[PDB]
Design a protein around this ligand. Sequence first.
Ligand SMILES: [Cl-]
Ligand SMILES: [Cl-]
Ligand SMILES: [Cl-]
Ligand SMILES: [Cl-]
Lengths: 225, 224, 225, 224
Amino acid sequence: NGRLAGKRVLLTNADAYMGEATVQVFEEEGAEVIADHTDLTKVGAAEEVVERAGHIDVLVANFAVDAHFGVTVLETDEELWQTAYETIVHPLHRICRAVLPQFYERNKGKIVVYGSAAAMRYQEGALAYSTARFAQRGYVTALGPEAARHNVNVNFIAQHWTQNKEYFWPERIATDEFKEDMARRVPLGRLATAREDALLALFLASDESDFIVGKSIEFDGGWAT
Amino acid sequence: GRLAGKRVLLTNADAYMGEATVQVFEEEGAEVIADHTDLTKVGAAEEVVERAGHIDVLVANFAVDAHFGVTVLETDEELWQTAYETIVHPLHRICRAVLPQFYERNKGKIVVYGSAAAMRYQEGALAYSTARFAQRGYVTALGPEAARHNVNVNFIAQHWTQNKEYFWPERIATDEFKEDMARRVPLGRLATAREDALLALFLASDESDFIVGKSIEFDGGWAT
Amino acid sequence: NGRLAGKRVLLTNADAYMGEATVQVFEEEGAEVIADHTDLTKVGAAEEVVERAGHIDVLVANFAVDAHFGVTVLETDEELWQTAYETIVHPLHRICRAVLPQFYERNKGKIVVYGSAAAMRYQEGALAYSTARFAQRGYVTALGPEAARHNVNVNFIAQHWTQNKEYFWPERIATDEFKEDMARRVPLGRLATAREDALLALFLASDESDFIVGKSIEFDGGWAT
Amino acid sequence: GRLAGKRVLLTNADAYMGEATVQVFEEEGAEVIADHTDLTKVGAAEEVVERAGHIDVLVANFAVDAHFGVTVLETDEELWQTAYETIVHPLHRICRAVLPQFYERNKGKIVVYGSAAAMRYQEGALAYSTARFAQRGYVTALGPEAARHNVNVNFIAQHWTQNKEYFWPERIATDEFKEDMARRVPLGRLATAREDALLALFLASDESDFIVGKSIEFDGGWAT
Ligand SMILES: [Cl-]
Ligand SMILES: [Cl-]
Ligand SMILES: [Cl-]
Ligand SMILES: [Cl-]
């Protein structure tokens, strides 16, 4: 059988960010993927999504927001700042808090967060976004060891240079300027495919990774090494 | 003195590490503007800076109840939001307010009193830890941007340091606390608030211009 | 349809440390495992092993030495200090330098190092050993991005609380101090089995992990989180 | 002075960051024992300490040619061994020699001039990086052990700092160097040797007793 045989996976914002490749990889490995499209910025929405989903073995916390490439600290206004937190930080705790009771009842569970390498090292021109990804990384760091006492794994994929619409859309990655910047800063010298990212998520969602607790795994071609 | 002629803007001066900052920095010749304005209000940071006038050093001193022992399932919406409202959003407001004059002079200093809960897992302090992580991320992301203007932004990742918010005199006398500290703090003691302010003094002084966007662990070895 | 189908894996010190589970897990996924038992502390031995081996797709750098638990800084004499470096540091460069030419020729390769969480954070009473593991972590950090330009992945497993004879022999597990660490310092509250560690190595040796470059992956039940 | 009445043992005082250490530490009242002994020799460290007598601070100043540009395939046995022989094994010899008197007094200070190559990938410096990582590991592992005796051991992870071994005048004078440096260093300049010594001064002073087994990145933001 497949590496997620029998498992049911709740995927947030399934059309956005890394959702499409998650569905493809996880379904090929036998999982039933609940592809949710609910806006989890609404208070109370997370508990409703979880109640409607039924039995959940794996939560894939898939959240993204415009990074506002090139916007400076002085141009990072109140609304831009707040929107980073409203979009990817507060919903992360809402959805995790909603799924953890059934994980705790069964003394088993899996949470995979698609995050950012901007939560690990300086990424130029993405200030509010970086701080919000740091907050996500902190949530995994703080919740991870707490949830591990209930045999629940929580882990953070610190991705960069990976194909997606929000940060590496086809038009952006085609220019000469982008290509020279990627060759300078990415040791592997290429972008990751979305599938490669979902293959790491697959490892972290599977029962092959039970000993990995509260970790940030840098998925960035060597950028932050 | 090591801060001779310098003017220092200190937020929430009666809270957290404020008192020791005044004492140490004034000892070294600084004029310390001991502000007590609530920076959770939009617009307050700009008014504080305009009234302060010339600022050489910003000490970003923010604290919030960590709610020690509260689990993930009991971290409700209001507790979570209050952590960010109290120590995260105001940090960008006050830094964004001081940077313009630093950029005109191509010189500035920002020191953030943070937490070692932004570096490693600290039991029973969930929302608080994530808010300190956000502050650490602000220093990590702003640091290299501001350094192009010769402005230093750095983060003190403190733990086991005397203060009212986290190590108030009652809590440090329990049996569980003393052997907690003995087991997990290699140095075997709490830091004085003065010792913390002496690190902030180094990072606020012109002896530390090459330190950019760094998290300095001030924890008696806890996170080593 | 094994995840290492068609691959040939050179495993050092194959009976020691993490070698036996590596053989079992990798062979179940279709790999041919060249299980070497050569003493690589001897200059020249690494190139001779690699020449004899023929075509290599994956190097598993499996090195261990007595940690000398409880030996203090003042009791760490010249011989004990040198032996840590001779046993797990110098051989690591020799065997990697020996394998890299054929990886570079094919613009493809995989190196997985079984290291230690002592390379990440303070571990009580294992001084010379910790510094030698830090040196191994440094080797992965420094080599990783250099080798990635040739599409070669080099990664470090920073393990702790994992089944092996060298560090978790039966009498240690029976001590009050170990039980205290499992209650207080290991969030998951158990040892990993060697299988689980080999499953992380399998991921890092497979073509599912080509975007992972020069990383230290903490395999420690949450201990360093 | 901030080191008034202190005696400081400085290794390899002619090399690396030694000259700036002498200048800054003597300005602050220290007596600096400027040792030039070859500590790759077994037995030498204990004789250095015996001759020095009472030591309050050890500044572990070790350097070796980084062999910039030499690839993994050209890092031969001799190049590799020389890195460890020059900056790794002597570090334990000299710390082991000074710790006994620190332990009698329950007080001591060790500052290691290391490298930011012990923190993140530095291109073209393979053997050197791994040897600096080993130094960082020594501080990380010894720090908490020594802190039990109120001894501080800390690591300066420096880069882009003026010295003869890595950033010598002829190397840093060219336009190619200055252009590459402006791209990789957020602060956009090299540090002076004195600035590095001012960090060592803080870590050697009694203002830094709560800092235990830490790596402080001294690199203008390079590794941030
Ligand atoms: Cl990405
Ligand atoms: Cl504190
Ligand atoms: Cl282990
Ligand atoms: Cl340097």
